[PDB]
Design a binder for this molecule. Structure first.
Ligand SMILES: Nc1ncnc2c1ncn2[C@@H]1O[C@H](COP(=O)(O)OP(=O)(O)OC[C@H]2O[C@H](O)[C@H](O)[C@@H]2O)[C@@H](O)[C@H]1O
Ligand SMILES: O=C(O)COCCOCCOCCOCCOCCO
Ligand code: NA
Ligand SMILES: [Zn+2]
Length: 272
């Protein structure tokens, strides 16, 4: 005996759920053309196995970075705003926002597509950082991301104007503290009246445990290829899994909401 996708739709449609917290990962940007991390074959971590890194995860490790920052900057150049557009997944979240129902959007992605899709900064927690800002690794001077863009685009490792130190984008590396705005989770998760989890394997903390931080009465909707994380191992009474392609799953929710025409209009106005 389980809730259905329609049940969740109808909670939203009626404004019974008005404080939706959303958690996303790299699966939401595969329909925009960006690989995820862990899909066999196409994921980034399967494909860095072939390069001169001790293991794929070294691309986000500081000792490796100091030894050779080139791989990380190759990734920065590709992900700096400009090459990808948000997809219907992102724009569903923007529609939810514009209807006044989004409490917060927590993202593990570094592609910046939530900001690109028009989610206001106050409504967004970029929990693994952003290319919007950068910090000198030597003197700790902060820079806007726009300052290093020309170097990044030019296949040049950006150096600090004062100390000549490598200027690193504010992407969270292993062992670094999460961003200040992550503090909001303390208030947002107890307040959420609905949790939506999209396109994440829930292999990595803190997002795996954050799925547990909503009240035990709160429905949790997973839209993902696979049943993962606490949703697989620690199910709750009001969980719902919409398994399969994320665009298909979102479009099925949208249809159940009666928002198809509005979604089509939004996507065409933003991306047509
Ligand atoms: N089109 C799609 N439709 C549905 N599900 C999809 C699709 N594409 C991929 N998936 C699912 O999307 C999920 C993608 O999982 P992962 O690749 O681990 O990404 P993360 O965001 O959770 O990685 C977390 C952190 O780990 C890193 O170290 C970085 O720090 C990351 O921020 C899988 O379950 C896919 O089956
Ligand atoms: O949606 C996201 O935010 C999460 O997925 C980000 C995936 O990044 C793929 C972009 O990297 C492309 C450039 O290749 C890196 C080269 O590494 C050096 C290998 O030698
Ligand atoms: Na994204
Ligand atoms: Zn410096």
């Amino acid at each position: 005996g389980k809730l259905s996708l329609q049940d969740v739709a109808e909670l939203i449609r009626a404004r019974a759920c008005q404080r939706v917290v959303v958690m996303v990962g790299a699966g939401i940007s595969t329909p925009s053309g960006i690989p995820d991390f862990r899909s066999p074959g196409s994921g980034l971590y399967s494909n860095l196995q072939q390069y001169d890194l001790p293991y794929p995860e070294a691309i986000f490790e500081l000792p490796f970075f100091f030894h050779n920052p080139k791989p990380f900057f190759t990734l920065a150049k590709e992900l700096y705003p400009g090459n990808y557009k948000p997809n219907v997944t992102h724009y569903f979240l923007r529609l939810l926002h514009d209807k006044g129902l989004l409490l917060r959007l927590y993202t593990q992605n570094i592609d910046g597509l939530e900001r690109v899709s028009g989610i206001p900064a106050s409504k967004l927690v970029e929990a693994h950082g952003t290319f919007a800002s950068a910090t000198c690794t030597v003197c700790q001077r902060p820079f806007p991301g726009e300052d290093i863009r020309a170097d990044v685009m030019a296949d040049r490792v950006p150096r600090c104007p004062v100390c000549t130190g490598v200027v690193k984008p504010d992407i969270v590396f292993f062992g670094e503290p999460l961003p200040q705005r992550f503090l909001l989770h303390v208030v947002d998760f107890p307040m959420a009246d609905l949790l939506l989890i999209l396109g994440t394997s829930l292999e990595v903390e803190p997002f795996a445990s954050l799925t547990e931080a909503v009240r035990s009465s709160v429905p949790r909707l997973l839209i993902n290829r696979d049943l993962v994380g606490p949703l697989a191992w620690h199910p709750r009474s009001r969980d719902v899994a919409q398994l399969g392609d994320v665009v298909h799953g979102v479009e099925s929710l949208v249809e159940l909401l009666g928002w198809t025409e509005e979604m089509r209009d939004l996507v065409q106005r933003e991306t047509g």
